[PDB]
Amino acid sequence: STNPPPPETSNPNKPKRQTNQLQYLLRVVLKTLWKHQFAWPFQQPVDAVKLNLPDYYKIIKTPMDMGTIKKRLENNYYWNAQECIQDFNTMFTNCYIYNKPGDDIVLMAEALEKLFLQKINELPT
Ligand SMILES: COc1cc(Nc2ncc3c(n2)N(C(C)C)c2ccccc2C(=O)N3C)ccc1N1CCN(C)CC1
Protein backbone atom coordinates (compact mmCIF):
# COMPACT_ATOMS: atom_id res chain seq x y z
CA SER A 1 0.00 0.00 0.00
CA THR A 2 2.93 2.25 -0.87
CA ASN A 3 3.29 5.93 -0.07
CA PRO A 4 4.19 8.34 -2.84
CA PRO A 5 7.16 10.64 -2.33
CA PRO A 6 6.13 13.65 -0.21
CA PRO A 7 5.41 16.99 -1.89
CA GLU A 8 8.48 19.05 -2.81
CA THR A 9 9.65 21.63 -0.27
CA SER A 10 12.08 23.27 -2.68
CA ASN A 11 12.33 23.75 -6.44
CA PRO A 12 15.35 25.42 -8.07
CA ASN A 13 13.42 26.50 -11.17
CA LYS A 14 10.62 28.14 -9.17
CA PRO A 15 11.33 31.70 -8.00
CA LYS A 16 11.33 32.47 -4.27
CA ARG A 17 9.86 35.36 -2.33
CA GLN A 18 9.47 36.79 1.13
CA THR A 19 6.63 39.13 2.09
CA ASN A 20 5.33 40.44 5.43
CA GLN A 21 2.26 38.26 4.92
CA LEU A 22 4.25 35.08 4.29
CA GLN A 23 6.42 35.82 7.34
CA TYR A 24 3.24 36.14 9.42
CA LEU A 25 1.84 32.88 8.04
CA LEU A 26 4.90 31.07 9.44
CA ARG A 27 5.57 32.99 12.65
CA VAL A 28 1.98 33.47 13.80
CA VAL A 29 -0.49 31.32 11.84
CA LEU A 30 1.26 27.98 11.31
CA LYS A 31 3.30 28.07 14.50
CA THR A 32 0.23 28.75 16.61
CA LEU A 33 -2.00 26.17 14.87
CA TRP A 34 0.79 23.62 15.29
CA LYS A 35 0.32 23.78 19.08
CA HIS A 36 -3.42 23.08 19.03
CA GLN A 37 -4.55 19.79 20.57
CA PHE A 38 -5.98 18.62 17.21
CA ALA A 39 -2.93 19.57 15.13
CA TRP A 40 -0.88 16.39 15.42
CA PRO A 41 -2.44 14.34 12.58
CA PHE A 42 -1.62 17.18 10.18
CA GLN A 43 2.04 17.64 11.12
CA GLN A 44 3.39 15.23 8.47
CA PRO A 45 2.27 13.56 5.23
CA VAL A 46 -0.36 10.85 5.71
CA ASP A 47 1.56 7.60 6.17
CA ALA A 48 -0.84 5.24 4.39
CA VAL A 49 1.32 2.20 5.07
CA LYS A 50 1.67 2.83 8.80
CA LEU A 51 -1.96 3.83 9.32
CA ASN A 52 -3.31 0.85 7.36
CA LEU A 53 -5.04 3.15 4.85
CA PRO A 54 -3.94 1.37 1.67
CA ASP A 55 -6.33 3.36 -0.56
CA TYR A 56 -5.48 6.82 0.77
CA TYR A 57 -3.37 7.82 -2.22
CA LYS A 58 -5.67 5.93 -4.58
CA ILE A 59 -8.19 8.62 -3.60
CA ILE A 60 -6.07 11.69 -2.77
CA LYS A 61 -3.95 12.91 -5.72
CA THR A 62 -2.83 16.29 -4.30
CA PRO A 63 -1.64 15.49 -0.76
CA MET A 64 -0.68 18.28 1.62
CA ASP A 65 0.13 18.65 5.32
CA MET A 66 1.48 21.26 7.75
CA GLY A 67 4.95 19.73 7.93
CA THR A 68 5.28 20.33 4.19
CA ILE A 69 3.81 23.84 4.48
CA LYS A 70 6.21 24.71 7.32
CA LYS A 71 9.23 23.60 5.25
CA ARG A 72 7.97 25.50 2.22
CA LEU A 73 7.64 28.67 4.33
CA GLU A 74 11.10 28.06 5.80
CA ASN A 75 12.44 27.68 2.21
CA ASN A 76 10.77 30.86 0.96
CA TYR A 77 9.27 28.47 -1.60
CA TYR A 78 6.08 30.46 -2.11
CA TRP A 79 5.57 33.54 -4.29
CA ASN A 80 2.83 34.97 -2.06
CA ALA A 81 0.46 34.37 0.86
CA GLN A 82 -2.40 33.18 -1.34
CA GLU A 83 -0.20 30.36 -2.64
CA CYS A 84 0.44 29.21 0.94
CA ILE A 85 -3.21 29.61 1.90
CA GLN A 86 -4.16 27.38 -1.03
CA ASP A 87 -1.99 24.64 0.50
CA PHE A 88 -3.79 24.86 3.85
CA ASN A 89 -7.12 24.64 2.04
CA THR A 90 -5.93 21.61 0.06
CA MET A 91 -4.95 19.89 3.32
CA PHE A 92 -8.38 20.44 4.86
CA THR A 93 -10.29 19.45 1.73
CA ASN A 94 -8.26 16.21 1.36
CA CYS A 95 -9.36 15.30 4.85
CA TYR A 96 -13.02 15.94 4.02
CA ILE A 97 -12.82 14.03 0.72
CA TYR A 98 -11.21 10.87 2.08
CA ASN A 99 -13.24 10.69 5.26
CA LYS A 100 -16.93 11.00 6.16
CA PRO A 101 -18.83 13.82 7.90
CA GLY A 102 -18.71 13.37 11.66
CA ASP A 103 -15.53 11.26 11.74
CA ASP A 104 -13.09 12.13 14.54
CA ILE A 105 -10.39 13.31 12.10
CA VAL A 106 -12.96 15.43 10.24
CA LEU A 107 -13.98 17.07 13.53
CA MET A 108 -10.30 17.86 14.03
CA ALA A 109 -9.88 19.40 10.57
CA GLU A 110 -13.09 21.44 10.98
CA ALA A 111 -11.86 22.95 14.25
CA LEU A 112 -8.43 23.76 12.82
CA GLU A 113 -9.95 25.27 9.69
CA LYS A 114 -12.06 27.67 11.77
CA LEU A 115 -8.98 28.72 13.75
CA PHE A 116 -7.00 29.08 10.51
CA LEU A 117 -9.66 31.36 8.97
CA GLN A 118 -9.85 33.42 12.15
CA LYS A 119 -6.09 34.00 11.97
CA ILE A 120 -5.79 34.90 8.26
CA ASN A 121 -8.83 37.20 8.35
CA GLU A 122 -6.42 40.05 8.95
CA LEU A 123 -2.85 39.92 7.63
CA PRO A 124 -0.11 42.52 8.00
CA THR A 125 0.25 45.22 5.33
C1 LIG B 1 1.68 9.02 16.29
O1 LIG B 1 2.24 10.09 15.53
C2 LIG B 1 1.55 10.63 14.47
C3 LIG B 1 0.46 9.97 13.92
C4 LIG B 1 -0.23 10.51 12.84
N1 LIG B 1 -1.28 9.82 12.33
C5 LIG B 1 -2.19 10.32 11.46
N2 LIG B 1 -1.83 11.15 10.45
C6 LIG B 1 -2.74 11.65 9.60
C7 LIG B 1 -4.09 11.30 9.69
C8 LIG B 1 -4.46 10.39 10.81
N3 LIG B 1 -3.48 9.94 11.60
N4 LIG B 1 -5.75 9.90 11.04
C9 LIG B 1 -6.20 9.64 12.41
C10 LIG B 1 -5.58 8.32 12.87
C11 LIG B 1 -5.83 10.78 13.35
C12 LIG B 1 -6.54 9.44 9.98
C13 LIG B 1 -7.23 8.24 10.17
C14 LIG B 1 -8.02 7.70 9.17
C15 LIG B 1 -8.17 8.33 7.95
C16 LIG B 1 -7.51 9.52 7.68
C17 LIG B 1 -6.69 10.10 8.65
C18 LIG B 1 -6.08 11.40 8.27
O2 LIG B 1 -6.69 12.05 7.42
N5 LIG B 1 -4.99 11.92 8.80
C19 LIG B 1 -4.64 13.30 8.49
C20 LIG B 1 0.18 11.74 12.30
C21 LIG B 1 1.27 12.44 12.82
C22 LIG B 1 1.99 11.93 13.90
N6 LIG B 1 3.11 12.61 14.41
C23 LIG B 1 4.26 11.77 14.75
C24 LIG B 1 5.33 12.53 15.53
N7 LIG B 1 5.51 13.86 14.95
C25 LIG B 1 6.68 14.51 15.56
C26 LIG B 1 4.29 14.61 15.25
C27 LIG B 1 3.12 14.08 14.43
Side-chain angles (χ1 to χ4, degrees), residues 30 33-47 51 56 63-71 87-99 103-113:
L30 186 143
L33 286 172
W34 194 273
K35 298 179 178 283
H36 190 281
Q37 68 163 343
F38 288 167
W40 59 271
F42 303 98
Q43 295 175 348
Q44 65 180 28
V46 170
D47 191 335
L51 292 170
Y56 186 83
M64 187 52 52
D65 66 273
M66 285 201 299
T68 297
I69 295 168
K70 187 170 180 281
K71 288 170 183 297
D87 276 351
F88 273 100
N89 285 320
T90 293
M91 182 187 70
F92 294 128
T93 55
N94 289 348
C95 186
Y96 307 141
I97 287 169
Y98 180 78
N99 298 287
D103 286 351
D104 281 351
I105 191 56
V106 168
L107 300 176
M108 301 171 86
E110 291 166 349
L112 289 171
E113 180 186 6

Coordinates of all heavy atoms in Angstrom, one line a residue, residues 30 33-47 51 56 63-71 87-99 103-113:
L30 N 0.9 29.4 11.3 CA 1.3 28.0 11.3 C 1.8 27.6 12.7 O 1.4 26.6 13.3 CB 2.3 27.6 10.2 CG 2.6 26.1 10.1 CD1 2.8 25.7 8.7 CD2 3.8 25.8 11.0
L33 N -1.1 27.3 15.2 CA -2.0 26.2 14.9 C -1.3 24.9 15.3 O -1.9 23.9 15.8 CB -2.4 26.1 13.4 CG -3.4 27.1 12.9 CD1 -3.5 27.1 11.4 CD2 -4.7 26.9 13.6
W34 N 0.0 24.8 15.0 CA 0.8 23.6 15.3 C 0.6 23.2 16.7 O 0.7 22.0 17.0 CB 2.3 23.9 15.0 CG 3.2 22.8 14.9 CD1 3.9 22.2 16.0 CD2 3.6 22.1 13.7 NE1 4.7 21.2 15.5 CE2 4.5 21.1 14.1 CE3 3.3 22.2 12.4 CZ2 5.1 20.2 13.2 CZ3 3.9 21.4 11.5 CH2 4.8 20.4 11.9
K35 N 0.4 24.1 17.7 CA 0.3 23.8 19.1 C -1.1 23.3 19.6 O -1.2 22.9 20.7 CB 0.8 25.0 19.9 CG 2.2 25.4 19.6 CD 2.6 26.6 20.5 CE 4.1 27.0 20.3 NZ 5.0 26.0 21.0
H36 N -2.1 23.5 18.7 CA -3.4 23.1 19.0 C -3.5 21.6 19.3 O -2.8 20.8 18.7 CB -4.4 23.5 17.9 CG -5.8 23.3 18.2 ND1 -6.5 22.1 18.2 CD2 -6.7 24.3 18.6 CE1 -7.7 22.3 18.6 NE2 -7.9 23.6 18.8
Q37 N -4.4 21.2 20.2 CA -4.6 19.8 20.6 C -5.0 18.9 19.4 O -4.8 17.6 19.5 CB -5.5 19.7 21.7 CG -7.0 20.0 21.4 CD -8.0 19.4 22.4 OE1 -7.7 18.6 23.2 NE2 -9.2 20.0 22.3
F38 N -5.5 19.4 18.3 CA -6.0 18.6 17.2 C -5.0 18.7 16.0 O -5.3 18.2 15.0 CB -7.4 19.1 16.7 CG -8.5 18.8 17.7 CD1 -9.7 19.4 17.5 CD2 -8.4 17.9 18.7 CE1 -10.8 19.1 18.3 CE2 -9.4 17.6 19.5 CZ -10.6 18.2 19.4
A39 N -3.9 19.3 16.2 CA -2.9 19.6 15.1 C -2.1 18.4 14.7 O -1.7 18.3 13.6 CB -2.0 20.8 15.4
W40 N -1.9 17.4 15.7 CA -0.9 16.4 15.4 C -1.1 15.6 14.1 O -0.1 15.2 13.5 CB -0.7 15.5 16.6 CG -2.0 14.8 17.1 CD1 -2.9 15.3 17.9 CD2 -2.5 13.5 16.6 NE1 -4.0 14.4 18.1 CE2 -3.7 13.3 17.3 CE3 -2.0 12.5 15.8 CZ2 -4.4 12.1 17.1 CZ3 -2.7 11.4 15.6 CH2 -3.9 11.2 16.2
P41 N -2.3 15.2 13.8 CA -2.4 14.3 12.6 C -2.0 15.0 11.3 O -1.7 14.4 10.3 CB -3.9 14.1 12.5 CG -4.5 14.4 13.9 CD -3.6 15.5 14.4
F42 N -1.9 16.4 11.4 CA -1.6 17.2 10.2 C -0.2 17.6 10.1 O 0.2 18.4 9.2 CB -2.6 18.4 10.1 CG -4.0 17.9 10.1 CD1 -4.8 17.9 11.3 CD2 -4.6 17.4 9.0 CE1 -6.1 17.4 11.3 CE2 -6.0 17.0 9.0 CZ -6.7 17.0 10.2
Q43 N 0.7 17.2 11.0 CA 2.0 17.6 11.1 C 3.0 16.9 10.2 O 4.2 17.3 10.2 CB 2.5 17.6 12.6 CG 1.8 18.5 13.5 CD 2.2 18.4 14.9 OE1 2.9 17.5 15.3 NE2 1.8 19.4 15.8
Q44 N 2.5 15.9 9.4 CA 3.4 15.2 8.5 C 2.5 14.7 7.4 O 1.3 14.6 7.5 CB 4.1 14.1 9.2 CG 3.2 13.0 9.7 CD 3.9 11.9 10.4 OE1 5.0 12.1 11.0 NE2 3.3 10.7 10.4
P45 N 3.1 14.2 6.3 CA 2.3 13.6 5.2 C 1.6 12.3 5.8 O 2.1 11.7 6.7 CB 3.3 13.1 4.2 CG 4.4 14.1 4.4 CD 4.5 14.3 5.8
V46 N 0.4 12.0 5.3 CA -0.4 10.9 5.7 C 0.5 9.6 5.4 O 0.8 9.4 4.2 CB -1.8 10.8 5.1 CG1 -2.4 9.4 5.3 CG2 -2.7 11.9 5.5
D47 N 0.8 8.8 6.4 CA 1.6 7.6 6.2 C 0.5 6.5 6.0 O 0.1 5.8 6.9 CB 2.5 7.3 7.4 CG 3.5 6.2 7.1 OD1 3.2 5.3 6.2 OD2 4.5 6.2 7.7
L51 N -0.6 3.7 8.8 CA -2.0 3.8 9.3 C -2.9 2.8 8.8 O -4.1 2.8 9.2 CB -2.5 5.2 9.0 CG -1.8 6.4 9.6 CD1 -2.3 7.7 9.0 CD2 -2.1 6.4 11.1
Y56 N -5.5 5.4 0.6 CA -5.5 6.8 0.8 C -5.0 7.6 -0.5 O -5.7 8.5 -0.9 CB -4.6 7.3 2.0 CG -4.7 8.7 2.2 CD1 -5.8 9.3 3.0 CD2 -3.8 9.6 1.7 CE1 -5.9 10.6 3.2 CE2 -3.9 11.0 1.9 CZ -5.0 11.5 2.7 OH -5.1 12.9 2.8
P63 N -1.8 15.5 -2.2 CA -1.6 15.5 -0.8 C -1.0 16.8 -0.2 O -0.2 17.4 -1.0 CB -0.7 14.3 -0.5 CG -0.2 13.9 -1.8 CD -1.1 14.4 -2.9
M64 N -1.3 17.1 1.0 CA -0.7 18.3 1.6 C -0.8 18.1 3.1 O -1.7 17.4 3.6 CB -1.3 19.6 1.1 CG -0.6 20.9 1.6 SD 1.2 20.9 1.3 CE 1.2 20.5 -0.5
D65 N 0.1 18.8 3.9 CA 0.1 18.7 5.3 C 0.9 19.8 5.9 O 1.6 20.5 5.1 CB 0.8 17.3 5.7 CG 2.3 17.3 5.3 OD1 2.6 16.9 4.2 OD2 3.1 17.7 6.2
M66 N 0.8 20.1 7.2 CA 1.5 21.3 7.8 C 3.0 21.1 7.9 O 3.7 22.1 7.9 CB 0.9 21.6 9.1 CG -0.5 22.3 9.0 SD -0.9 23.2 10.5 CE -0.9 21.9 11.8
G67 N 3.5 19.9 7.9 CA 5.0 19.7 7.9 C 5.5 20.3 6.6 O 6.5 21.0 6.6
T68 N 4.9 19.9 5.5 CA 5.3 20.3 4.2 C 5.1 21.8 4.1 O 6.0 22.5 3.6 CB 4.4 19.6 3.1 OG1 4.7 18.2 3.1 CG2 4.8 20.2 1.7
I69 N 4.0 22.4 4.6 CA 3.8 23.8 4.5 C 4.9 24.6 5.3 O 5.4 25.6 4.8 CB 2.4 24.2 5.0 CG1 1.4 23.6 4.0 CG2 2.2 25.7 5.1 CD1 -0.1 23.7 4.5
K70 N 5.2 24.1 6.5 CA 6.2 24.7 7.3 C 7.6 24.8 6.6 O 8.2 25.8 6.6 CB 6.4 23.9 8.6 CG 7.3 24.5 9.6 CD 7.2 23.8 11.0 CE 8.1 24.4 12.0 NZ 9.5 24.0 11.8
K71 N 8.0 23.7 6.0 CA 9.2 23.6 5.3 C 9.2 24.5 4.1 O 10.2 25.2 3.8 CB 9.5 22.2 4.8 CG 9.9 21.2 5.9 CD 10.0 19.8 5.4 CE 10.3 18.8 6.5 NZ 11.7 19.1 7.1
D87 N -2.5 25.9 0.0 CA -2.0 24.6 0.5 C -2.7 24.2 1.8 O -3.1 23.0 1.9 CB -0.5 24.7 0.8 CG 0.4 24.4 -0.5 OD1 -0.2 24.0 -1.5 OD2 1.6 24.6 -0.4
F88 N -3.0 25.2 2.7 CA -3.8 24.9 3.8 C -5.2 24.3 3.4 O -5.6 23.3 3.9 CB -4.0 26.1 4.7 CG -2.8 26.3 5.7 CD1 -1.8 27.2 5.4 CD2 -2.9 25.7 6.9 CE1 -0.8 27.5 6.4 CE2 -1.8 25.9 7.9 CZ -0.8 26.8 7.6
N89 N -5.8 25.0 2.5 CA -7.1 24.6 2.0 C -7.1 23.3 1.4 O -8.0 22.5 1.6 CB -7.7 25.7 1.1 CG -8.2 26.9 1.9 OD1 -8.8 26.8 3.0 ND2 -8.0 28.1 1.3
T90 N -6.1 22.9 0.6 CA -5.9 21.6 0.1 C -5.9 20.5 1.1 O -6.5 19.5 1.0 CB -4.7 21.6 -0.9 OG1 -4.9 22.4 -2.0 CG2 -4.5 20.1 -1.3
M91 N -5.1 20.8 2.2 CA -4.9 19.9 3.3 C -6.3 19.6 4.0 O -6.6 18.4 4.2 CB -4.0 20.5 4.4 CG -3.7 19.6 5.6 SD -2.7 20.5 6.8 CE -4.0 21.7 7.4
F92 N -7.1 20.6 4.2 CA -8.4 20.4 4.9 C -9.3 19.7 3.9 O -9.9 18.7 4.3 CB -9.0 21.8 5.3 CG -8.2 22.5 6.3 CD1 -7.8 23.8 6.2 CD2 -7.9 21.8 7.5 CE1 -7.1 24.5 7.2 CE2 -7.2 22.5 8.5 CZ -6.8 23.8 8.3
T93 N -9.4 20.1 2.7 CA -10.3 19.4 1.7 C -10.0 18.0 1.5 O -10.9 17.1 1.4 CB -10.4 20.2 0.4 OG1 -9.1 20.4 -0.2 CG2 -11.0 21.6 0.6
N94 N -8.7 17.6 1.5 CA -8.3 16.2 1.4 C -8.9 15.4 2.5 O -9.4 14.3 2.3 CB -6.7 16.1 1.4 CG -6.1 16.5 0.2 OD1 -6.7 16.8 -0.8 ND2 -4.7 16.7 0.2
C95 N -8.9 16.0 3.7 CA -9.4 15.3 4.8 C -10.9 15.1 4.7 O -11.4 14.0 5.0 CB -9.1 16.1 6.1 SG -9.5 15.2 7.6
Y96 N -11.6 16.1 4.2 CA -13.0 15.9 4.0 C -13.4 15.0 2.9 O -14.4 14.2 3.0 CB -13.7 17.3 3.8 CG -13.3 18.4 4.8 CD1 -13.1 19.7 4.4 CD2 -13.2 18.0 6.1 CE1 -12.7 20.6 5.4 CE2 -12.9 19.0 7.1 CZ -12.7 20.3 6.7 OH -12.3 21.2 7.7
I97 N -12.6 14.9 1.9 CA -12.8 14.0 0.7 C -12.6 12.6 1.1 O -13.5 11.7 0.7 CB -11.9 14.4 -0.5 CG1 -12.3 15.7 -1.1 CG2 -11.9 13.3 -1.5 CD1 -11.3 16.3 -2.1
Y98 N -11.5 12.3 1.8 CA -11.2 10.9 2.1 C -12.1 10.3 3.2 O -12.3 9.1 3.2 CB -9.7 10.7 2.4 CG -9.4 9.2 2.8 CD1 -9.2 8.3 1.7 CD2 -9.3 8.8 4.1 CE1 -8.9 7.0 2.0 CE2 -9.0 7.5 4.3 CZ -8.8 6.6 3.3 OH -8.6 5.2 3.6
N99 N -12.5 11.1 4.1 CA -13.2 10.7 5.3 C -14.7 11.0 5.2 O -15.2 11.6 4.1 CB -12.6 11.3 6.5 CG -11.2 10.8 6.7 OD1 -10.9 9.7 7.1 ND2 -10.2 11.8 6.5
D103 N -16.7 12.1 11.3 CA -15.5 11.3 11.7 C -14.7 12.1 12.7 O -14.6 13.3 12.5 CB -14.7 10.8 10.6 CG -15.3 9.7 9.7 OD1 -16.3 9.1 10.2 OD2 -14.7 9.4 8.7
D104 N -14.0 11.4 13.6 CA -13.1 12.1 14.5 C -12.1 13.0 13.8 O -11.9 14.2 14.2 CB -12.4 11.1 15.5 CG -13.2 10.7 16.6 OD1 -14.3 11.2 16.8 OD2 -12.8 9.8 17.4
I105 N -11.4 12.5 12.8 CA -10.4 13.3 12.1 C -11.0 14.5 11.4 O -10.4 15.6 11.3 CB -9.5 12.4 11.1 CG1 -8.3 13.2 10.6 CG2 -10.4 11.9 10.0 CD1 -7.4 13.7 11.6
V106 N -12.2 14.3 10.9 CA -13.0 15.4 10.2 C -13.3 16.5 11.3 O -13.2 17.7 11.0 CB -14.2 14.9 9.5 CG1 -15.1 16.1 9.1 CG2 -13.8 14.1 8.3
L107 N -13.7 16.1 12.5 CA -14.0 17.1 13.5 C -12.7 17.9 13.9 O -12.8 19.0 14.2 CB -14.5 16.4 14.8 CG -15.8 15.6 14.6 CD1 -16.2 14.9 15.9 CD2 -17.0 16.6 14.2
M108 N -11.6 17.2 13.8 CA -10.3 17.9 14.0 C -10.0 18.9 12.9 O -9.6 20.0 13.3 CB -9.2 16.9 14.2 CG -9.4 15.9 15.3 SD -8.2 14.5 15.4 CE -6.9 15.2 16.3
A109 N -10.1 18.5 11.7 CA -9.9 19.4 10.6 C -10.8 20.6 10.6 O -10.4 21.7 10.4 CB -10.0 18.7 9.2
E110 N -12.1 20.4 10.9 CA -13.1 21.4 11.0 C -12.7 22.5 12.0 O -12.9 23.7 11.8 CB -14.5 20.9 11.3 CG -15.1 20.1 10.1 CD -16.3 19.3 10.6 OE1 -16.6 19.2 11.8 OE2 -17.0 18.7 9.7
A111 N -12.3 22.1 13.2 CA -11.9 23.0 14.3 C -10.6 23.8 13.8 O -10.6 25.0 14.0 CB -11.6 22.2 15.5
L112 N -9.6 23.1 13.2 CA -8.4 23.8 12.8 C -8.7 24.7 11.7 O -8.1 25.8 11.6 CB -7.4 22.8 12.4 CG -6.7 21.9 13.4 CD1 -5.8 20.8 12.8 CD2 -5.9 22.8 14.4
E113 N -9.6 24.4 10.8 CA -9.9 25.3 9.7 C -10.6 26.6 10.2 O -10.3 27.6 9.6 CB -10.8 24.6 8.6 CG -11.2 25.5 7.5 CD -12.2 24.8 6.5 OE1 -12.7 23.7 6.8 OE2 -12.4 25.4 5.4

